[PDB]
Each structure stands twice: as structure tokens, then as C-alpha cells.
Amino acid sequence: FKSFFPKPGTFFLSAFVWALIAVIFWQAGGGDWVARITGASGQIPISAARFWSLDFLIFYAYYIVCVGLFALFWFIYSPHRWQYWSILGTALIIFVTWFLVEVGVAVNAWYAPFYDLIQTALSSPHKVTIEQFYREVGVFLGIALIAVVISVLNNFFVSHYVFRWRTAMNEYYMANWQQLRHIEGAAQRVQEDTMRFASTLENMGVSFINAIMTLIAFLPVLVTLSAHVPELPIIGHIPYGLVIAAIVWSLMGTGLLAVVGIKLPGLEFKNQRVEAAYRKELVYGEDDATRATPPTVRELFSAVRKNYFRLYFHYMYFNIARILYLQVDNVFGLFLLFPSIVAGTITLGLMTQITNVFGQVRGAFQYLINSWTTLVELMSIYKRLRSFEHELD
Amino acid sequence: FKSFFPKPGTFFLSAFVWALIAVIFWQAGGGDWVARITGASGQIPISAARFWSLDFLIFYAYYIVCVGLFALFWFIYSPHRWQYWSILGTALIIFVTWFLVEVGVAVNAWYAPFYDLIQTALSSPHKVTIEQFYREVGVFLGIALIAVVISVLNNFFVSHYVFRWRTAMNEYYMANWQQLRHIEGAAQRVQEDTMRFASTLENMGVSFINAIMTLIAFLPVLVTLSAHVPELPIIGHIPYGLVIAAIVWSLMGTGLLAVVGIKLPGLEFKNQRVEAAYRKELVYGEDDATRATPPTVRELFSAVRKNYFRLYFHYMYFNIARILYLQVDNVFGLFLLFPSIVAGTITLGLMTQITNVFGQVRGAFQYLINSWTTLVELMSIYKRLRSFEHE
């Protein structure tokens, strides 16, 4: 952290505070006040040309200025060797993560005109020509090429950014290698842990903000869509139906799974301890003939087997909750629309757009849920590195 | 392999041959001939009760007999300690993998009546009551509970089966520990490689057959669905158009991605070599105070930088092909139906059922595509393990 980011204790606190001020200013008065000066209308095209429209160009300049002011302050307050990768590189990664989310919002907005065309064609034969379908797919493809080009370049930069984090960590560890030479497993920490720490931390760092950005991007979408869905199946009429139900289903559903699997991180940590003890005895017995004896390794593997069997038993309840939540989530989006579908207040495009919004939010959160094992790995790596640096003193 | 399974050279060859004979006999004459004796009609219910119907019960008995005959032969030909886990356990895992595929086929068949109801409701306000929608979701939920219960129990048994594989490997290595004691890194191989080898090999073993089973299960589905899709967009009329287009898009599309990423497994293996050389020097330098040699570790990490940078550049082309294929795959299912949608020869349920078939086949194959890195890990582990017992 200290080798890559400048003063991590204050840098991340300052970044969070500065981002909060920038977000608050833009979402309250900044967004409209800047647009009035430039003269940008709210008509955002559904096609791929919306990403270089006036409204999107303004946000590109606003993000650059906010990052530039943040970067210039930290370039003078405390210079760093990797300040161009830690500060500016993360801002690029955060921006591209937001951009790929807004591409999904553009794709989601395309599901309404397309499936309204499908409903028109199905409702009456020989009414919609095949040329209209070709153009609509052409609109989707235009957004797809933007998604393809940016995503391909995103993985290229993220991989290069991660390697610079490893390079920063490796340079710090190799500089004071003489004091770190005598630490047990020092070679693994310098080589295996530096790449693992950077890759793991960056992966869930992007995954966490991507899940948050998915909510932030689709909440205004659901507020506009909730006008066509005034009635809910069991809980009746609510001023904000879809927005409340989606938030409750997503956040509490994600929150409840964490509550069900509270014991899982503890069991995984214990599994790592018994495996390490089994490995540690084997390492000692590699040279000494009195170590790693049959009755010694028998009890150690029994502890490994017993704790692993405990993890499988507890993870069974997590599987029950996780899989049941996934199966219901496949039909929950349509379940909320049953009173509106019956009453004929929505079209097939609105039905598919609302269901897609739930699907995109579900997919963003699924990467977060499936990364709980990844989180346990990161804490294990960090503790090994923290102990490795503590010995350095 | 030899520690867990019976003789791997003949056991796997016999299993493949016996499965082929059982598959050929059942799919040609066995399926109908057994059904005629029992007297089971071909009408498979769409609800969750199809899994204990006469047609499915017959296949359960046929699979048990075929596995039992295979098991009894190998129980007498060459007894093994882990013969109830390697032989019978794998048969259970293969069967459950097939069962979860047939659950997806049952779910896919449910998309036709449900979305035909949705189209009816949308086409005429106040025509379909909300009670019909509640019942249809209840049908889906019944299938879901079977999927939930079996999947939860499948993961429980697979994890326990994998640990028995590690237990079999650990017992073999620890028995001859004195001979394997002097091998460098022996502690890592016995502890970490045994679980990694079992977990990795089993994961892709199920993933490979699941992709095959998904294609096999949905081919008869697409043959029946292709009757409602006589015209294709660019190639016009063609017999079995949906079946041919789906096979070409899926199999050749997956095959083309492997062709694009031919150099990727080679680059990953080289990346592991330069890491090993860098780690090997660091390990030696832990004790010796003269071979740390900051100039030496400078060149070793430079070789790490150059090879990783080469992997990132080549993987960019794979990303271009992979991501472009995924984006087109999202619309390819509907693209084939455009002449049918315009002519009004299909309904919304048929539209969604066909699109779901492509989605289920796509999702099954994506687990195989995303596991290409997992292939490289297994080969590295196997080579490390193979050199371990060579001694």
C-alpha cells in the first residue's frame, strides 16, 4: 500500500471525501448548472452515439477536472514514484468500470423499442418488415462494438496496472532484502504473495464498486419504470413499487446470505490453519528422520479431515439459501409485474426492460456473492504480508 | 489415478466402451423395447412430477443395471480399497450431472406455456386472471425445489468424493514417505498438490460432460422446435435449420476461440517457468548471503516482466474474439427467428423456448471456455506430480 499509494491512511480517506463532495455537487446542482452553460438537452439517444453526445462529454470533462484537482493536490503534497499509476491509473479504472455500467444501461434501454417491435410483429403477421429487425440489431451491435473495444482495452490496462502494483511491492521488498532474508517463507511472500495480493485486491475492488455503480445507474431507471407498475401482487399499491421491491430483494437478499454464511469465513480460516500445521510438520520431516512420523501425520490429517468435513456441512446451509435465492430470482422480476401484465398497463418492451434491470443488478451482485471465497483468500494473504513486514520493522 | 481408481489404462477405456454400448443400445432399440414391456406412454409432464414418472423411472433402473454390471465386473476383476468411491461415486456424480441437465430441459419446456400465457394477457387486457400466473409460477417452483435439493446434495457429495481422492493420494504418498522424503518440495506435493489435483480434475471432468450432456439433451429439443422455423435469414430454407445453425454456432464458435488462443497455453507455461526460476533463486538466496545478487534478481524479474507483457498482448486478441462472440451470441438466437417472427409462424413461448435453448447451451459452454485457464493449472499440477513419483 505505502509502496504504491501516497500515504494510504490519508489518501483513501481524502479520495472518499473528495468523491463524495464531487458526487453530491454533481447530483444536486452541478449536473444541471453546467449543462445550462453548455446548452445540453436531456434527449439521450438509445443508439451508440450517446457516448459522445453533449451530456456525456460534459461528464467526461467534469470527471477529468475532479480527478485532475485531486491528482495535482497529491502530486505536490507528497510525490510518489508510482503516483501516475496509483492515482491516475485507478481513476481510469474507476471511470472504465462506470463506462461499462453505462453501456449496460444503454443496452437495457434498447430492450424496450426492440421487444415492442417483436410484440407488434407477433400480434399481426406481415406487419413489421425484416428490415426493421435488421436495423434494430444494428443499433445493438453499435453499442456492442463500443463494449467490445473498451472491455478489451480495460483488461489490458488492468493487467498492466496490477503488474505495476507487483513491481512496486517487489521493489520495496527487494530493497531491504537483507533484513527480510531470514524470514521463513520470504521467497513465497516476495514472489507469490505480491502478485496474488495485487490481483485479488484489485479484482474485488472493481467488483465492489461495479455492484454499487449498477445500483446507482439503475435506480433512476427504475424510478421512471415504476410509473407503469402502480400495483404489486401482495403488498398492494405503493408510491414507489419497483424501486422499493428491487432494493429490498437485492440488498436484503445479499445481506441475508452474508448472515447465513457468517460462520463460513471462520471455518475457512481454521481450514487454512490445520493445512498449514500439516504442511509445517512435513517440512520439518523432510530432513529429520524423527519427524513426520506415521502416528504424528495421522492425527494432523485427521484434524484436516475433521475441519474440512465441518466446512462441507455448514456450507450445505449456505448452498440451500444461495441456490433457493437464485431460483426465485429467476421469476421474481416477472412476479412483480403480474398485476400490470394482467391489467394490460405495460408492453413487452417494458416487461423485458424491467426484467433486464433486475437481471443486470442480479449479475452484478452474483459476482460479489461468488467472490466471498476470494475475500477470505485476500485476508489470508494480507495477514501473511503484514506479518512479513512486521518482522522487517 | 492408480491409487484411487482401478487400473487407469483399462478402467477408463472399459468405462468409455461400456458407456458407448449402453448409449447405443438404449438410443436405438433399448429405450423403446424396455418401455413396451413396462407400458409407459411417451407423454412427459411439464411439471416437476416428470422426474418420478414411468419413463424416468425406467431410465433410473437401466442406469443402475448398467453401472451395476460394470461395477460387479471390476469388483471381481481387480478389487480396490476405494472402489465404492471411484467406481460407484463417479457413476453417482455422472448421473446427478445428467439429472441437473434434465432439470434444465424441464425448465426450458416450461417457458413455452408460460410465455404463451403472457402473450395472451398482453394481447387482451383482463383476459387472463392472476390466478393462472400464480399456478404457472408454482409449477416452476416445484421444479426449482428439486433443482435446489439435488444441487445442494450434489455439492455435498462432490466435495466428499474429492476429499476421498485426496485421502487416497495422501495415503499412497505417506506410505512411501521415506523414499519421497528427499524430493525437493515434497511437502507441497503431498499436501497442496493432492487436493488441487483432485479438485481441479473433478471440476473440469464434470464441466466437460455437462457441456456434452447439455448439447445431447437439447438436440432432440431443437429437432422438434425446428419444425416451426422453416426459413432462416440469410441461407433461406434448409432442413433442420435450427439444429444446424445451433451446432455450427456453438461447436465451431467454441472451436474457433480455441484456435485463436492456441498460443495462450504455451505462454502461460512459460510464465510459470520464469516465476519458478525467480522463486528458485530467492529460495537459494534465503540462506546464502552472496547469491542474493541484486543484479541477478534484476534480470530474473525482467524475464518475468517480458513474458507477462507478452501474455497480456496475446490475450488481447483472445479478448477481442471472446467478447465479440459473447455480444453476438446475445442476439444470434433472435436473429435466426426473424423470418419466423415477421411471418407470424411462432408464438412468444416458442420464441422464448428456442432462445432459452441457445442460452442454456451457451451457459454450459461458457463454463468450459472460462475454464481454459483451469486446464493449464491441471497440466502444471500433473507434471509436478508425475515427476514426483518418477524418482
Coordinates of N, CA and C in Angstrom, one line a residue, chain A residues 32-230:
Chain A
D32 N -27.0 20.0 -13.5 CA -27.9 20.9 -14.3 C -27.2 22.3 -14.6
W33 N -26.5 22.8 -13.6 CA -25.9 24.1 -13.8 C -24.8 24.1 -14.9
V34 N -24.0 23.1 -15.0 CA -23.0 23.0 -16.1 C -23.7 22.8 -17.4
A35 N -24.8 22.0 -17.4 CA -25.5 21.7 -18.7 C -26.1 23.0 -19.2
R36 N -26.7 23.8 -18.4 CA -27.3 25.1 -18.8 C -26.3 26.0 -19.5
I37 N -25.0 26.1 -18.9 CA -24.0 26.9 -19.5 C -23.6 26.4 -20.9
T38 N -23.5 25.0 -21.0 CA -23.1 24.4 -22.3 C -24.3 24.4 -23.3
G39 N -25.5 24.1 -22.8 CA -26.6 24.0 -23.6 C -26.9 22.6 -24.1
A40 N -26.9 21.6 -23.2 CA -27.2 20.2 -23.5 C -28.6 19.8 -23.1
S41 N -29.3 19.2 -24.0 CA -30.7 18.8 -23.8 C -30.6 17.4 -23.2
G42 N -31.7 17.0 -22.6 CA -31.9 15.7 -22.0 C -32.2 14.5 -22.9
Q43 N -32.3 14.8 -24.2 CA -32.6 13.8 -25.2 C -31.4 12.9 -25.4
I44 N -31.3 11.8 -24.7 CA -30.1 10.9 -24.9 C -30.5 9.8 -25.9
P45 N -29.8 9.7 -27.0 CA -30.2 8.7 -28.0 C -30.0 7.3 -27.4
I46 N -30.8 6.4 -27.9 CA -30.7 5.0 -27.4 C -29.6 4.2 -28.2
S47 N -29.1 4.8 -29.3 CA -28.1 4.1 -30.1 C -26.7 4.3 -29.4
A48 N -25.6 3.9 -30.1 CA -24.3 4.0 -29.6 C -23.7 5.4 -29.6
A49 N -24.4 6.4 -30.2 CA -24.0 7.7 -30.4 C -24.2 8.6 -29.1
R50 N -24.8 8.0 -28.1 CA -25.0 8.7 -26.8 C -23.7 8.9 -26.0
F51 N -22.7 8.1 -26.3 CA -21.5 8.1 -25.5 C -20.5 9.3 -25.9
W52 N -20.8 9.9 -27.0 CA -20.1 11.1 -27.4 C -21.0 12.3 -27.6
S53 N -22.2 12.2 -27.0 CA -23.2 13.3 -27.1 C -22.7 14.4 -26.1
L54 N -23.5 15.5 -26.1 CA -23.1 16.7 -25.3 C -23.2 16.3 -23.8
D55 N -24.2 15.6 -23.4 CA -24.4 15.3 -22.0 C -23.3 14.4 -21.5
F56 N -22.8 13.4 -22.3 CA -21.8 12.5 -21.8 C -20.4 13.2 -21.9
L57 N -20.2 14.1 -22.9 CA -19.0 14.9 -23.0 C -18.8 15.8 -21.8
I58 N -19.8 16.4 -21.3 CA -19.8 17.2 -20.1 C -19.3 16.4 -18.9
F59 N -19.8 15.2 -18.7 CA -19.4 14.3 -17.6 C -17.9 13.9 -17.7
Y60 N -17.5 13.7 -19.0 CA -16.1 13.4 -19.2 C -15.2 14.5 -18.7
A61 N -15.5 15.7 -19.0 CA -14.8 16.9 -18.6 C -14.8 17.1 -17.1
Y62 N -16.0 16.9 -16.5 CA -16.2 17.0 -15.1 C -15.4 16.0 -14.3
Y63 N -15.4 14.7 -14.8 CA -14.6 13.7 -14.1 C -13.1 14.0 -14.3
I64 N -12.7 14.5 -15.4 CA -11.2 14.8 -15.6 C -10.8 15.9 -14.7
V65 N -11.6 17.0 -14.5 CA -11.3 18.1 -13.7 C -11.2 17.7 -12.2
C66 N -12.2 16.9 -11.8 CA -12.3 16.4 -10.4 C -11.1 15.5 -10.1
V67 N -10.7 14.6 -11.0 CA -9.6 13.8 -10.8 C -8.3 14.6 -11.0
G68 N -8.2 15.6 -11.9 CA -7.1 16.4 -12.0 C -6.8 17.2 -10.8
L69 N -7.8 17.9 -10.2 CA -7.6 18.6 -9.0 C -7.2 17.7 -7.9
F70 N -7.7 16.5 -7.8 CA -7.3 15.5 -6.8 C -5.9 15.1 -7.0
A71 N -5.5 14.9 -8.3 CA -4.2 14.5 -8.7 C -3.1 15.6 -8.4
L72 N -3.4 16.8 -8.8 CA -2.5 17.9 -8.6 C -2.2 18.1 -7.2
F73 N -3.2 18.0 -6.3 CA -3.0 18.2 -4.9 C -2.0 17.1 -4.3
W74 N -2.2 15.9 -4.7 CA -1.4 14.8 -4.2 C 0.0 14.8 -4.9
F75 N 0.1 15.4 -6.1 CA 1.4 15.5 -6.8 C 2.3 16.5 -6.1
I76 N 1.7 17.4 -5.4 CA 2.5 18.4 -4.7 C 2.6 18.1 -3.2
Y77 N 1.5 17.6 -2.6 CA 1.5 17.3 -1.2 C 2.6 16.2 -0.8
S78 N 2.6 15.2 -1.6 CA 3.6 14.1 -1.3 C 3.8 13.4 -2.7
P79 N 4.9 13.7 -3.3 CA 5.3 13.0 -4.6 C 5.6 11.5 -4.3
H80 N 5.2 10.7 -5.4 CA 5.4 9.3 -5.3 C 6.0 8.8 -6.7
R81 N 6.8 7.7 -6.6 CA 7.3 7.2 -7.9 C 6.2 6.6 -8.7
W82 N 5.2 5.9 -8.1 CA 4.1 5.3 -8.9 C 2.8 6.2 -8.7
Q83 N 3.0 7.5 -8.6 CA 1.8 8.4 -8.5 C 1.0 8.4 -9.8
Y84 N 1.7 8.2 -10.9 CA 1.0 8.2 -12.2 C 0.2 6.9 -12.4
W85 N 0.5 5.9 -11.7 CA -0.2 4.6 -11.8 C -1.2 4.4 -10.7
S86 N -0.8 4.8 -9.5 CA -1.7 4.6 -8.3 C -2.9 5.6 -8.3
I87 N -2.6 6.9 -8.7 CA -3.6 7.9 -8.6 C -4.4 8.0 -9.9
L88 N -3.6 8.2 -11.0 CA -4.3 8.4 -12.3 C -4.8 7.1 -12.9
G89 N -4.0 6.0 -12.6 CA -4.4 4.7 -13.1 C -5.7 4.2 -12.5
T90 N -5.9 4.4 -11.2 CA -7.1 4.0 -10.5 C -8.3 4.8 -11.0
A91 N -8.1 6.1 -11.2 CA -9.2 6.9 -11.8 C -9.6 6.4 -13.1
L92 N -8.7 6.0 -14.0 CA -9.0 5.4 -15.3 C -9.8 4.1 -15.1
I93 N -9.4 3.3 -14.1 CA -10.1 2.0 -13.9 C -11.5 2.2 -13.4
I94 N -11.6 3.2 -12.5 CA -12.9 3.5 -11.9 C -13.8 4.1 -13.0
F95 N -13.3 4.9 -13.9 CA -14.1 5.5 -15.0 C -14.5 4.5 -15.9
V96 N -13.6 3.5 -16.3 CA -14.0 2.5 -17.3 C -15.0 1.5 -16.7
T97 N -14.9 1.3 -15.4 CA -15.9 0.5 -14.7 C -17.3 1.2 -14.7
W98 N -17.3 2.5 -14.5 CA -18.5 3.2 -14.7 C -19.0 3.2 -16.2
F99 N -18.1 3.3 -17.1 CA -18.5 3.4 -18.5 C -19.1 2.0 -19.0
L100 N -18.5 0.9 -18.5 CA -19.1 -0.4 -18.9 C -20.5 -0.6 -18.3
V101 N -20.7 0.0 -17.1 CA -22.0 0.0 -16.5 C -23.0 0.8 -17.3
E102 N -22.6 2.0 -17.8 CA -23.5 2.8 -18.6 C -23.7 2.2 -20.0
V103 N -22.8 1.4 -20.4 CA -23.0 0.6 -21.7 C -24.2 -0.4 -21.4
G104 N -24.2 -1.0 -20.3 CA -25.3 -1.9 -19.9 C -26.6 -1.2 -19.8
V105 N -26.6 0.1 -19.3 CA -27.8 0.9 -19.2 C -28.3 1.2 -20.6
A106 N -27.3 1.5 -21.5 CA -27.7 1.8 -22.9 C -28.3 0.5 -23.6
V107 N -27.7 -0.7 -23.3 CA -28.3 -1.9 -23.8 C -29.7 -2.2 -23.2
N108 N -29.8 -1.9 -21.9 CA -31.1 -2.1 -21.2 C -32.2 -1.2 -21.8
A109 N -31.8 0.0 -22.1 CA -32.8 0.9 -22.7 C -33.2 0.5 -24.2
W110 N -32.3 -0.3 -24.8 CA -32.6 -0.8 -26.2 C -33.6 -1.9 -26.2
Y111 N -33.8 -2.6 -25.0 CA -34.8 -3.7 -24.9 C -36.2 -3.3 -25.1
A112 N -36.5 -2.0 -24.8 CA -37.9 -1.5 -24.9 C -38.3 -1.3 -26.4
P113 N -37.6 -0.6 -27.2 CA -38.0 -0.5 -28.6 C -38.0 -1.8 -29.4
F114 N -37.0 -2.6 -29.0 CA -36.9 -3.9 -29.8 C -38.0 -4.8 -29.5
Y115 N -38.3 -5.1 -28.2 CA -39.4 -6.0 -27.9 C -40.8 -5.5 -28.1
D116 N -40.9 -4.1 -28.2 CA -42.2 -3.6 -28.7 C -42.4 -3.9 -30.2
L117 N -41.3 -3.9 -30.9 CA -41.3 -4.3 -32.3 C -41.7 -5.8 -32.5
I118 N -41.1 -6.6 -31.6 CA -41.4 -8.1 -31.6 C -42.9 -8.3 -31.3
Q119 N -43.4 -7.6 -30.3 CA -44.8 -7.7 -30.0 C -45.7 -7.3 -31.1
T120 N -45.3 -6.2 -31.8 CA -46.1 -5.8 -33.0 C -46.1 -6.8 -34.1
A121 N -44.9 -7.4 -34.3 CA -44.8 -8.4 -35.4 C -45.7 -9.7 -35.0
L122 N -45.6 -10.1 -33.8 CA -46.3 -11.3 -33.3 C -47.8 -11.1 -33.3
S123 N -48.2 -9.9 -32.9 CA -49.6 -9.6 -32.8 C -50.4 -9.7 -34.1
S124 N -49.7 -9.4 -35.2 CA -50.3 -9.4 -36.5 C -49.3 -9.8 -37.6
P125 N -49.5 -10.9 -38.3 CA -48.5 -11.3 -39.3 C -48.4 -10.3 -40.4
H126 N -47.2 -10.2 -41.0 CA -46.9 -9.4 -42.2 C -47.2 -7.9 -42.0
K127 N -46.8 -7.4 -40.8 CA -47.0 -6.0 -40.4 C -45.6 -5.3 -40.3
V128 N -44.6 -6.0 -39.7 CA -43.3 -5.5 -39.5 C -42.4 -6.2 -40.4
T129 N -41.7 -5.4 -41.3 CA -40.7 -6.0 -42.2 C -39.5 -6.4 -41.5
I130 N -38.7 -7.4 -42.2 CA -37.5 -7.9 -41.6 C -36.4 -6.8 -41.6
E131 N -36.6 -5.7 -42.4 CA -35.6 -4.7 -42.4 C -35.5 -3.9 -41.1
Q132 N -36.7 -3.8 -40.5 CA -36.7 -3.1 -39.2 C -36.0 -3.9 -38.1
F133 N -36.1 -5.2 -38.2 CA -35.3 -6.0 -37.2 C -33.8 -6.0 -37.5
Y134 N -33.4 -5.9 -38.8 CA -32.0 -5.7 -39.1 C -31.4 -4.4 -38.6
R135 N -32.2 -3.3 -38.7 CA -31.7 -2.1 -38.2 C -31.6 -2.1 -36.6
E136 N -32.6 -2.7 -36.0 CA -32.6 -2.7 -34.5 C -31.4 -3.5 -34.0
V137 N -31.1 -4.6 -34.6 CA -29.9 -5.4 -34.3 C -28.6 -4.6 -34.6
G138 N -28.7 -3.8 -35.7 CA -27.5 -2.9 -36.0 C -27.3 -1.9 -34.9
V139 N -28.4 -1.4 -34.3 CA -28.2 -0.5 -33.2 C -27.6 -1.2 -32.0
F140 N -28.0 -2.4 -31.7 CA -27.4 -3.2 -30.6 C -25.9 -3.5 -30.9
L141 N -25.6 -3.8 -32.2 CA -24.2 -4.1 -32.5 C -23.3 -2.9 -32.3
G142 N -23.8 -1.7 -32.7 CA -23.0 -0.5 -32.5 C -22.6 -0.3 -31.0
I143 N -23.6 -0.5 -30.1 CA -23.3 -0.5 -28.7 C -22.3 -1.6 -28.3
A144 N -22.5 -2.8 -29.0 CA -21.6 -3.9 -28.7 C -20.2 -3.7 -29.0
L145 N -19.9 -3.0 -30.2 CA -18.5 -2.8 -30.5 C -17.9 -1.8 -29.5
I146 N -18.6 -0.8 -29.0 CA -18.1 0.1 -28.0 C -17.8 -0.7 -26.7
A147 N -18.7 -1.7 -26.4 CA -18.4 -2.5 -25.2 C -17.2 -3.4 -25.5
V148 N -17.1 -4.0 -26.7 CA -16.0 -4.9 -27.0 C -14.7 -4.2 -26.9
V149 N -14.6 -3.0 -27.6 CA -13.3 -2.3 -27.6 C -12.9 -1.8 -26.2
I150 N -13.8 -1.3 -25.5 CA -13.5 -0.8 -24.1 C -13.1 -1.9 -23.2
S151 N -13.9 -3.0 -23.2 CA -13.6 -4.1 -22.3 C -12.3 -4.7 -22.6
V152 N -11.9 -4.9 -23.9 CA -10.7 -5.5 -24.3 C -9.5 -4.6 -23.8
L153 N -9.7 -3.3 -24.0 CA -8.6 -2.4 -23.5 C -8.6 -2.2 -22.0
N154 N -9.8 -2.5 -21.3 CA -9.8 -2.4 -19.9 C -9.0 -3.6 -19.3
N155 N -9.2 -4.8 -19.8 CA -8.4 -5.9 -19.2 C -6.9 -5.7 -19.5
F156 N -6.6 -5.1 -20.6 CA -5.2 -4.8 -20.9 C -4.6 -3.8 -19.9
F157 N -5.3 -2.8 -19.6 CA -4.8 -1.8 -18.7 C -4.8 -2.3 -17.2
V158 N -5.9 -3.0 -16.9 CA -6.0 -3.6 -15.5 C -4.8 -4.6 -15.2
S159 N -4.5 -5.4 -16.2 CA -3.4 -6.4 -16.0 C -2.1 -5.6 -15.9
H160 N -1.9 -4.6 -16.7 CA -0.7 -3.8 -16.6 C -0.6 -3.0 -15.4
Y161 N -1.8 -2.5 -14.9 CA -1.8 -1.8 -13.6 C -1.5 -2.7 -12.5
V162 N -2.0 -3.9 -12.5 CA -1.8 -4.9 -11.5 C -0.3 -5.2 -11.4
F163 N 0.3 -5.4 -12.5 CA 1.8 -5.7 -12.6 C 2.6 -4.6 -12.0
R164 N 2.2 -3.3 -12.2 CA 2.9 -2.2 -11.6 C 2.8 -2.2 -10.1
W165 N 1.6 -2.7 -9.6 CA 1.5 -2.9 -8.1 C 2.4 -4.0 -7.6
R166 N 2.6 -5.1 -8.4 CA 3.5 -6.1 -8.0 C 5.0 -5.5 -8.1
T167 N 5.2 -4.8 -9.2 CA 6.5 -4.2 -9.3 C 6.9 -3.2 -8.2
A168 N 5.9 -2.4 -7.7 CA 6.1 -1.5 -6.6 C 6.3 -2.3 -5.3
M169 N 5.6 -3.4 -5.1 CA 5.8 -4.2 -3.9 C 7.1 -5.0 -4.0
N170 N 7.5 -5.5 -5.2 CA 8.7 -6.3 -5.3 C 9.9 -5.4 -5.1
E171 N 9.9 -4.1 -5.6 CA 11.0 -3.2 -5.4 C 11.2 -2.9 -3.9
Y172 N 10.0 -2.7 -3.2 CA 10.1 -2.4 -1.8 C 10.7 -3.6 -1.0
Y173 N 10.3 -4.8 -1.3 CA 10.8 -6.0 -0.6 C 12.2 -6.3 -0.9
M174 N 12.6 -6.2 -2.2 CA 13.9 -6.5 -2.6 C 15.0 -5.5 -2.2
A175 N 14.5 -4.2 -2.0 CA 15.5 -3.2 -1.5 C 16.0 -3.6 -0.1
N176 N 15.1 -3.8 0.8 CA 15.5 -4.3 2.2 C 15.4 -5.9 2.2
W177 N 16.1 -6.5 1.3 CA 16.1 -8.0 1.2 C 17.0 -8.6 2.3
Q178 N 18.0 -7.9 2.7 CA 18.9 -8.5 3.7 C 18.2 -8.7 5.0
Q179 N 17.4 -7.7 5.4 CA 16.6 -7.9 6.7 C 15.4 -8.8 6.5
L180 N 14.9 -9.0 5.3 CA 13.8 -9.9 5.0 C 14.3 -11.3 4.6
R181 N 15.7 -11.5 4.5 CA 16.2 -12.7 4.0 C 15.9 -13.9 5.0
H182 N 16.0 -13.6 6.3 CA 15.9 -14.7 7.3 C 14.5 -15.0 7.7
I183 N 13.5 -14.4 7.1 CA 12.1 -14.7 7.5 C 11.7 -16.0 6.8
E184 N 11.0 -16.9 7.5 CA 10.6 -18.1 6.9 C 9.6 -17.9 5.8
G185 N 9.8 -18.5 4.7 CA 8.9 -18.3 3.5 C 9.0 -17.0 2.9
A186 N 10.1 -16.3 3.0 CA 10.3 -15.0 2.4 C 10.2 -15.0 0.9
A187 N 10.7 -16.1 0.3 CA 10.6 -16.2 -1.2 C 9.2 -16.2 -1.7
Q188 N 8.3 -17.0 -1.0 CA 6.9 -17.0 -1.4 C 6.2 -15.7 -1.2
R189 N 6.5 -15.0 -0.1 CA 5.9 -13.7 0.1 C 6.3 -12.7 -1.0
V190 N 7.6 -12.6 -1.4 CA 8.0 -11.7 -2.4 C 7.5 -12.0 -3.8
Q191 N 7.5 -13.3 -4.1 CA 7.1 -13.7 -5.4 C 5.6 -14.0 -5.6
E192 N 5.1 -15.0 -4.8 CA 3.7 -15.5 -5.0 C 2.7 -14.5 -4.4
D193 N 3.0 -13.9 -3.2 CA 2.1 -13.1 -2.5 C 1.9 -11.7 -3.1
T194 N 2.9 -11.1 -3.7 CA 2.8 -9.8 -4.2 C 1.9 -9.7 -5.4
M195 N 2.0 -10.7 -6.3 CA 1.0 -10.8 -7.4 C -0.3 -11.2 -7.0
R196 N -0.4 -12.1 -6.0 CA -1.7 -12.5 -5.5 C -2.5 -11.4 -4.8
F197 N -1.7 -10.7 -4.0 CA -2.3 -9.6 -3.2 C -2.9 -8.5 -4.2
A198 N -2.1 -8.1 -5.2 CA -2.5 -7.1 -6.2 C -3.6 -7.6 -7.0
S199 N -3.6 -8.8 -7.5 CA -4.6 -9.3 -8.4 C -5.9 -9.5 -7.6
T200 N -5.9 -10.0 -6.4 CA -7.1 -10.3 -5.6 C -7.7 -9.0 -5.1
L201 N -6.9 -8.0 -4.6 CA -7.4 -6.8 -4.1 C -8.1 -6.0 -5.2
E202 N -7.4 -5.9 -6.4 CA -8.0 -5.1 -7.5 C -9.2 -5.8 -8.0
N203 N -9.3 -7.1 -8.0 CA -10.5 -7.8 -8.6 C -11.7 -7.5 -7.8
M204 N -11.6 -7.5 -6.4 CA -12.8 -7.2 -5.6 C -13.0 -5.7 -5.4
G205 N -11.9 -5.0 -5.6 CA -12.1 -3.5 -5.6 C -12.9 -3.0 -6.7
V206 N -12.7 -3.6 -7.9 CA -13.6 -3.2 -9.1 C -14.9 -3.9 -8.9
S207 N -15.0 -5.1 -8.4 CA -16.3 -5.8 -8.2 C -17.2 -5.1 -7.2
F208 N -16.6 -4.5 -6.2 CA -17.4 -3.8 -5.2 C -18.0 -2.6 -5.7
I209 N -17.2 -1.8 -6.4 CA -17.7 -0.5 -7.0 C -18.6 -0.8 -8.2
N210 N -18.4 -1.9 -8.9 CA -19.2 -2.2 -10.0 C -20.6 -2.6 -9.5
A211 N -20.7 -3.3 -8.4 CA -22.0 -3.6 -7.8 C -22.7 -2.3 -7.3
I212 N -22.0 -1.4 -6.7 CA -22.5 -0.1 -6.3 C -22.9 0.7 -7.5
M213 N -22.1 0.8 -8.5 CA -22.4 1.6 -9.7 C -23.6 1.0 -10.4
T214 N -23.8 -0.3 -10.4 CA -25.0 -0.9 -11.0 C -26.3 -0.4 -10.3
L215 N -26.3 -0.3 -9.0 CA -27.4 0.2 -8.3 C -27.6 1.7 -8.6
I216 N -26.6 2.4 -8.5 CA -26.7 3.9 -8.8 C -27.2 4.2 -10.2
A217 N -26.7 3.4 -11.2 CA -27.1 3.7 -12.5 C -28.6 3.2 -12.8
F218 N -29.0 2.2 -12.2 CA -30.4 1.6 -12.5 C -31.5 2.1 -11.5
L219 N -31.1 2.8 -10.4 CA -32.2 3.4 -9.6 C -33.0 4.5 -10.3
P220 N -32.4 5.5 -11.0 CA -33.2 6.4 -11.8 C -34.0 5.7 -12.9
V221 N -33.4 4.6 -13.4 CA -34.1 3.8 -14.4 C -35.4 3.2 -13.8
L222 N -35.3 2.7 -12.6 CA -36.5 2.0 -12.0 C -37.5 3.0 -11.5
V223 N -37.0 4.3 -11.2 CA -38.0 5.3 -10.8 C -38.9 5.7 -11.9
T224 N -38.3 5.8 -13.2 CA -39.1 6.1 -14.3 C -40.0 4.9 -14.7
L225 N -39.5 3.7 -14.6 CA -40.2 2.5 -14.9 C -41.3 2.2 -13.9
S226 N -41.2 2.6 -12.7 CA -42.2 2.3 -11.7 C -43.5 3.1 -11.9
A227 N -43.5 4.1 -12.8 CA -44.8 4.8 -13.2 C -45.8 3.8 -13.9
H228 N -45.2 2.9 -14.7 CA -46.1 1.9 -15.4 C -46.4 0.7 -14.5
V229 N -45.9 0.6 -13.3 CA -46.2 -0.5 -12.4 C -46.8 0.0 -11.1
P230 N -48.0 0.5 -11.0 CA -48.5 1.1 -9.8 C -49.0 0.0 -8.8

